[PDB]
Design a protein around this ligand. Structure first.
Ligand SMILES: Nc1nc2c(ncn2[C@@H]2O[C@H](COP(=O)(O)OP(=O)(O)OP(=O)(O)O)[C@@H](O)[C@H]2O)c(=O)[nH]1
Ligand SMILES: [Mg+2]
Ligand SMILES: [Mg+2]
Lengths: 285, 188, 51, 63, 65
RNA sequence: AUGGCCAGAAAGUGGUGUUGACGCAAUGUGAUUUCUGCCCAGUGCUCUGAAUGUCAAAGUGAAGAAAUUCAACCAAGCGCGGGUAAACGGCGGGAGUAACUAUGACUCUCUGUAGCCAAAUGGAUUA
RNA sequence: AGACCCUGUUGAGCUUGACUCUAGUUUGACAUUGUGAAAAGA
RNA sequence: GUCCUAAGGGGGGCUCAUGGAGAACAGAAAUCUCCAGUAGAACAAAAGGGUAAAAGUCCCCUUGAUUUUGAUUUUCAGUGU
RNA sequence: GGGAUGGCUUGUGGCGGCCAAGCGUUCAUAGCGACGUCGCUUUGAUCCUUCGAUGUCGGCUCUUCCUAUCAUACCGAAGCAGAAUUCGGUAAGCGUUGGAUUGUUCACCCACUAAUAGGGAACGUGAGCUGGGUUUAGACCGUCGUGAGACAGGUUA
């Protein structure tokens, strides 16, 4: 990296303690239907700021070989991928791919219902501002399986998708849109994705009365094939790093409210019962 | 005087009271005085003795806690201050388990400072006794506190009434097997 | 650890301070502040002198 | 040997080394008001603070 | 800057201790080194904490820590 | 006792030894009274407990016409793995657990104006 | 012509995992070293 | 063997390689003009989709060559502001 | 085997700013600047803040010198009534003392007195007598070191 700009790019791509927000690459296979492309466009519109788009046709079957997916992730620094596909067996498929260290961590297929699908443009409402993260609601009994399953991985993937940029503070004017995923434990269960805008009304109390209006897109999914993580790779990915601004707690050492370092001492209970006083001549009767 | 200097100028130094010669008082009175002094500073009860000490393990534990709190430094230094003849050198000897500092009932036995290695990271510094100057302290008060040698004072009979006031009469009668005096001159 | 880093850890060689490693020094003959290395550095002294 | 004692020109000589905001000052003033004395705690490292801007003023009779 | 402080009871004295002859500033929470490992002696009577500082623009001299 | 501790250049040499554990030899401390801060296990002390890991000379095998070279095998000690005089040394405590054995690691929180109890005394403030 | 201080291709006593050795001690091998058995390998 | 108010950063303007058609010397190749030009140039890397009112290239400003603070992270500290 | 700063010093702070008679300059109006002044360094208080020995001083016994005068003599001034003084001048002729305290920079307290002045002649190395800095060899205690030993040191002969 002789160039300072290339050095900056390398430092941006370098591993960090506090990671960058994840980037999602949107790409399609050699055959991909118009409904699948519309679904991909709606997801990209929800995630514009941290996404890149491919426009060519890629001869990739991810559950057979993902070498090209790993190459694309390493080239574009994208750790989330949305892959569109179509077939006779699978007419409308979105494959969510999550990667770790430019290798496939896990993969999940979503089968889209074409008849119930509605785009964002099919609702005449004011839409979400660009870059605004929405609130999230996950509903139903399908997301509390004791063993990790397709619905648990789908919840994790959708959280990583609609996560946005983390922040310690949020404006109260930035709570106007909610994304609701509903799925019930059971012939296959249906994972339903809906987006709503939020209106508040006076209710006579301090808390306002919430009302919702549909925003789009309307999506019905059936969970399909699954690629589970290796346990060692999963442990590596689920490790959490401590920031330097997280103090390692020392015994008996603390900080007071003025910033002074304070140490605590422990005297113990005074037990003078085992002390014999001096048998003085003036006390000996 | 020294407490005010320590509070004003060196608040980072840790002041610890040590009540010595607790074998000369009733234990209930020693506990009451400990409860009074611990409102201001942490207080350790101690009988200073090489052979038969009291409070030695507790004081060692407190110094160990201070050493752990200052584990970044190479050591902690613990300076012993107080009045003459209160038992500073005796406390150093009791903590060491060996006669390392000179001990006498003569006030002013220790004249210069002395470094004693208690453990690898703990030093003890013996100091001569100090008498903070007060305009309300009388020579009789200093003599009864033990500041001076009584061999070098003129007219020692004048301080006997203060001793007779301080000591209960039956205690003196039992000490000297003597009774029936009406004043200090006839007692002497 | 590099070879220098392992050697410095073995020999107790401390890292230099940021004031110590500054690219600046006082030349008394000219009475001026000059860089030790780099452009017009002191390591290339005399290469542009007239004589 | 007699060294050359020279200070170099530097923009760092003409800046503010330590700054503090009004919110931090107010937090420290509230802590100063609420602080209490504990015999079983010791001070190990003082915080470098502008204590003249944090400490409460003297009594009006004294002033 | 430094003067040699001599130690030992013999006629030939050890000379490793150096006393600073100029005023010094030791900073807050200062505790002196133990005497066996104290090479540089900064004596108590030469330690300063305040300075008379003049502001050139305001033409005001204040005593500052 | 086919021993310990010594001596001699060696000796079919001498001593301890006309000796045998209530003895001999080497240490440290130093009458009596007082007296063994609490707990370990890093250095050390010692365990023939399994290994060949290191592994000399001699011996064994292979090649070569031979000089020679290459291989295994390989005592004690070291190393590895156990118990300590626990001497030096280190060592703020007390609960827990998910580790499960060493090293744990991660939370919690700690402040009688002359008595009682001990085989008269409570001492070293020792004649 | 002491004592003190300074210098040495300095002398000497003393200490220690300083260097090279070494008494003592310990371990292996060859020789002194003979006569019969039983077992396992050539 | 030479030359440079260094590189870097921010902002702004502009568009390249090449081909065709034209302009005294000038003729395959010197400079100017128009048109066409997905980058086929340049600069980075080693794309299987790097960058075009720019990441290219020229102007303006900074060039101060490794700032200050931290009770926090890791390591060290017989000289622990 | 060598070796063992000085016609100095004294009574009035430093830093920053301002003013300033004057010096310079007057094709540049800058630069020096005495005398001053201004800012940083408890309503007679508090007595609950004493801030580091590498550097050594002593005492008798006795003589002389200086004056930078404490007392004695004379003189000038002050609300100096008197008395007692205070400030200053000439003056070294004549005196300037016992005593306490070594847990200690032995410096301060007490008294008498007319008064209890300050220095030099050593301390710009240095054989009168005799105590402390002080230190050959004996010995403990503390600190450091595996040790021989050394020292932050303390004690004894
Ligand atoms: N009875 C009793 N006597 C004690 C105790 N501690 C000390 N003493 C006595 O008090 C006297 C004073 O002892 P030191 O050690 O010299 O005390 P100090 O304060 O250091 O005395 P200085 O050195 O003169 O300042 C000694 O004679 C001890 O016997 C105690 O705990 N009990
Ligand atoms: Mg003492
Ligand atoms: Mg004493």
């Amino acid at each position: 990296p002789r160039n300072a700009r290339s050095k900056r790019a390398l430092e941006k791509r370098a591993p960090k303690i506090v990671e960058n927000p994840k980037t999602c690459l949107f790409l399609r296979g050699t055959t991909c239907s118009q409904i699948t492309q519309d679904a991909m466009n709606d997801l990209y519109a929800m995630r514009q700021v941290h996404a890149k788009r491919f426009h060519k046709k890629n001869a990739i079957h991810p559950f057979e070989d993902a070498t090209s997916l790993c190459f694309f992730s390493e080239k574009n620094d994208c750790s989330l991928m949305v892959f569109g596909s179509s077939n006779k067996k699978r007419p409308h498929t979105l494959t969510f791919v999550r990667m770790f260290d430019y290798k496939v961590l896990d993969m999940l297929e979503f089968y889209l219902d074409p008849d119930t699908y509605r785009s964002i443009s099919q609702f005449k409402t004011s839409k979400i501002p660009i870059g605004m993260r929405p609130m999230m609601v996950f509903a139903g009994t399908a997301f509390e399986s004791p063993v990790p399953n397709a619905f648990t991985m789908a919840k994790s993937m959708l959280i990583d998708f609609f996560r946005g940029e983390p922040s310690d503070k949020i404006d109260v004017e930035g709570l106007r849109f909610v994304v609701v995923v509903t799925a019930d434990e059971p012939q296959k269960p249906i994972l339903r994705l809906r987006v709503y805008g939020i209106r508040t009304k006076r209710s006579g109390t301090r808390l306002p009365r919430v009302e919702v209006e549909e925003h789009g897109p309307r999506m019905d999914f059936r969970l399909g094939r699954m690629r589970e993580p290796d346990p060692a790779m999963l442990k590596e990915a689920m490790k959490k790093a401590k920031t330097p601004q997280e103090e390692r707690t020392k015994k008996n050492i603390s900080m007071d409210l003025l910033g002074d370092k304070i140490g605590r001492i422990h005297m113990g209970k005074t037990d003078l019962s085992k002390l014999q006083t001096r048998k003085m001549k003036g006390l000996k009767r | 005087h020294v407490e005010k200097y320590l509070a004003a100028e060196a608040p980072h130094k840790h002041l610890v009271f040590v009540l010595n010669k607790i074998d000369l008082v009733p234990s209930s009175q020693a506990a009451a005085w400990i409860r009074i002094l611990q409102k201001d500073h942490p207080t350790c009860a101690m009988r200073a003795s090489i052979t038969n000490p009291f409070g030695r393990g507790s004081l060692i534990d407190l110094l160990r806690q201070f050493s752990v709190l200052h584990k970044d430094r190479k050591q902690i230094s613990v300076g012993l201050i107080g009045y003459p003849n209160v038992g500073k050198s005796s406390i150093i000897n009791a903590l060491r388990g060996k006669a390392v500092a000179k001990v006498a009932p003569i006030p002013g036995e220790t004249k210069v400072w002395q470094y004693v290695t208690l453990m690898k990271r703990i030093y003890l510094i013996d100091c001569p006794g100090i008498v903070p100057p007060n305009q309300h302290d009388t020579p009789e008060d200093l003599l009864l506190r033990g500041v001076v040698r009584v061999e070098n004072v003129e007219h020692p009979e004048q301080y006997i009434p203060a001793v007779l006031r301080k000591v209960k009469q039956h205690h003196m009668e039992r000490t000297y097997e003597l009774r029936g005096w009406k004043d200090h001159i006839e007692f002497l | 650890e590099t070879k220098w880093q392992a050697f410095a850890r073995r020999r107790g060689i401390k890292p230099k301070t940021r004031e110590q490693r500054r690219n600046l020094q006082y030349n008394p003959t000219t009475g001026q502040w000059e860089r030790k290395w780099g452009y017009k550095g002191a390591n290339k002294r005399g290469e542009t002198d007239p004589i | 040997e007699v060294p050359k004692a020279v200070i170099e020109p530097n923009r760092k000589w003409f800046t503010n080394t330590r700054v503090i905001s009004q919110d931090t000052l107010q937090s420290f003033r509230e802590a100063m008001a609420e602080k209490q004395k504990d015999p079983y705690t010791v001070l190990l490292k003082s915080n470098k603070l502008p204590m003249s801007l944090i400490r409460d003023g003297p009594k009006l009779e004294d002033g | 800057m430094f003067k040699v402080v001599k130690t030992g009871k013999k006629t030939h004295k050890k000379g490793w201790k150096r006393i600073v002859t100029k005023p010094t500033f030791v900073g807050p929470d200062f505790t002196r080194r133990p005497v066996k490992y104290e090479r540089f002696i900064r004596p108590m009577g030469l330690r300063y904490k305040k300075a008379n500082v003049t502001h050139p623009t305001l033409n005001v001299t204040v005593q500052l820590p």
